[PDB]
Design a protein around this ligand. Structure first.
Ligand code: COA
Lengths: 4, 155
């Protein structure tokens, strides 16, 4: 889960 | 392979709306009109997942040249709570492992996880990913802010  | 209720499908302008709608319920961070614009160009690397012809999941990836390596970065990969532990996530991951395997040119694949995400670690570890780093305060505004980095080697 990227961000960011 | 046969009698399975789960199928993946291409993401298209016609259904992107629904990908967006699924990423919002599953993931705590929100993604911008760029992320989604980008997925329409990545091909097989963005897929919706259906259970009995219902969209309950999705995965979105990207190719990364970082560290002087060719890398597959998984940005999102999840499925609505009620449909978990049915093998849906496995379908999405394997699909991605297959692409990499045929292409032959990837050094590794990887992704970030909130350290509190115990189930995602059980999941990714089953496939051979290892925790290789723990970045502090990676995420901006959620709790907890820390993230493991997970990675499986291909080369
Ligand atoms: C992680 C996630 C994608 C799992 O997907 P799923 O479709 O439920 O996973 P599967 O049904 O394919 O599970 C495969 C195996 O992973 C392991 N596993 C997955 N969740 C587990 C859990 N909560 N506890 C123990 N083992 C687990 C199990 O060994 C499981 O096999 P089993 O069901 O036969 O025991 C899902 O829980 C999710 O949507 N999480 C939120 C999204 C997220 O944070 N994703 C991280 C990638 S960015």
């Amino acid at each position: 889960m990227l961000g960011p | 392979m046969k009698g399975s209720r789960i199928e993946l499908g291409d993401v298209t302008p016609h259904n992107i709306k629904q990908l967006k709608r699924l990423n919002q319920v599953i993931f705590p961070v929100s993604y911008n009109d760029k992320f989604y614009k980008d997925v329409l160009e990545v091909g097989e690397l963005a897929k919706l997942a259906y259970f009995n012809d219902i969209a309950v999941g999705a995965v979105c990836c990207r190719v990364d040249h970082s560290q002087n390596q060719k890398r597959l970065y998984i940005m999102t990969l999840g499925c609505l709570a009620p449909y978990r532990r049915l093998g849906i996530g496995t379908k999405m991951l394997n699909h991605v492992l297959n692409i990499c395997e045929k292409d032959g040119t990837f050094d590794n694949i990887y992704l970030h996880v909130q350290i509190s995400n115990e189930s995602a670690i059980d999941f990714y570890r089953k496939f051979g990913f290892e925790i290789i780093e723990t970045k502090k305060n990676y995420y901006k505004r959620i709790e907890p802010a820390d993230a493991h980095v997970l990675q499986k080697n291909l080369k």
